């Protein structure tokens, strides 16, 4: 019943005291955070409190969309020796700091995601050459489907790959994806290995990567410029915004204190120093 938008408990008036009750004392040893209120130690007047936690509820903490990647595509001239670059990005929040740290506060979570795609383009060669408005395709290849090979092979016939066709110069594109985990919650951390090295086998085939699980494998996104070759080369970038919605979490962990290094929890040398200098005696 107590919703997020409820007023915090009104602080009671309390006067002088000389009793055997000891509020003030604890023994953090138990592990219990001593639960005192202002009125417990000092004298308080009555106060009708109006502040509510409404803007810090799990929902609101993740309520902002966030950049997750920068995918590069381009459409060079047909005369060019280099091949028309189509980008393929594996879907993982771990590619950028920002969302990851916000997600790390929790061991597990269930969240239906909403993706937004802002696509910006530009010329490269200093030619007063033109280019007609381009049309992009963002194809979601789920784990195991054939990943595109050429900017123009069959794979793009999207028989079943849910795709999006975005014309440039229009409002950014957006799609909703429900919770797609193979579990009951997405694992932000996986302690263990996929393969158990067996006693009657080669170490090679018995070896995997620590903290690498399928739990967080979700296929790739394929992006290409649909318009064919154009005399004047035009590169473009596709920024992907992810905003977790209908979110819920489990088990708090301490926030990441030193610069992240790679997909694991691992850290690099030099970066292991977070706090600064300050004196024990200077306020």
């Amino acid at each position: 019943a107590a919703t997020s938008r409820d007023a915090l408990p009104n602080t009671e008036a309390s006067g002088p005291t000389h009793s055997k009750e000891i509020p003030a004392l604890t023994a953090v040893e138990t592990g219990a955070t001593n639960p005192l209120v202002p009125s417990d130690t000092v004298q308080t007047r009555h106060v009708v409190q109006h502040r509510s936690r409404s803007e810090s509820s799990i929902e609101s903490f993740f309520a902002r969309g966030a950049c997750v990647t920068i995918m590069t595509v381009d459409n060079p001239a047909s005369t060019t020796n280099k091949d028309k670059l189509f980008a393929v990005w594996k879907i993982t929040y771990k590619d950028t700091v920002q969302l990851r740290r916000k997600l790390e506060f929790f061991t597990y979570s269930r969240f239906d995601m909403e993706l937004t795609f802002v696509v910006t383009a530009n010329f490269t060669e200093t030619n007063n050459g033109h280019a007609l408005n381009q049309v992009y395709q963002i194809m979601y290849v789920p784990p195991g489907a054939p990943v595109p090979e050429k900017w123009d092979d069959y794979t793009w016939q999207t028989s079943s790959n849910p795709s999006i066709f975005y014309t440039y110069g229009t409002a950014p594109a957006r799609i909703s994806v429900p919770y797609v985990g193979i579990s009951n919650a997405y694992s932000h951390f996986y302690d263990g290995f996929s393969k158990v090295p067996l006693k009657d086998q080669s170490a090679a085939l018995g070896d995997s990567l620590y903290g690498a699980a399928s739990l967080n494998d979700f296929g790739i996104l394929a992006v290409r410029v649909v318009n064919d070759h154009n005399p004047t080369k035009v590169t473009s970038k596709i920024r992907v915004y992810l905003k977790p919605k209908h979110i819920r979490v489990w088990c708090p962990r301490p926030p990441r204190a030193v610069a992240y290094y790679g997909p694991g929890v691992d850290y690099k040398d030099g970066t292991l120093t977070p706090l600064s200098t300050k004196d024990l005696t200077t306020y």
Epitope: W89, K195, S208, L209
Partner: nanobody
């Protein structure tokens, strides 16, 4: 298709040290399992050392192990092969293959390798 632009052989004599560079053209990120090889003149086409793109873990061939070290240029998509202690028998047409990957499984020889390199030959004179 992934392209593996290799570089760059030569027939220096015993104990030598050269290196091979091979690009991801290609989309080096989580996929490719950049591996090394050398075709022992018609005998002959063995796998040298192989690196994992995702983590940077190397494994070598019982032959090359130690002298040869596989290096990785993550950001500029290149995988090197510091060919050390080049002895006469380090004469063979070198290779650079790169397959895909298993999400978490280490890049080994029994695993890859879908795509093929140029096959730039390094010979060790006697």
């Amino acid at each position: 298709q992934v392209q593996l632009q290799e570089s760059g052989g030569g027939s220096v004599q015993a104990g030598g040290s050269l290196r091979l560079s091979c690009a991801a053209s290609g989309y080096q990120y989580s996929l490719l399992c950049m591996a090394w090889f050398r075709q022992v003149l018609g005998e002959g086409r063995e796998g040298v050392a192989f690196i994992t793109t995702y983590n940077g873990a190397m494994r070598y061939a019982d032959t090359v192990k130690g002298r040869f070290t596989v290096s990785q240029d993550k950001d500029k998509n290149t995988v090197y092969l510091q060919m050390n202690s080049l002895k006469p028998e380090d004469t063979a047409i070198y290779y650079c293959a790169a397959g895909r990957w298993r999400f978490g499984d280490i890049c080994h020889e029994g695993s890859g390798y879908n795509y093929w390199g140029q096959g730039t030959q390094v010979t060790v004179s006697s």
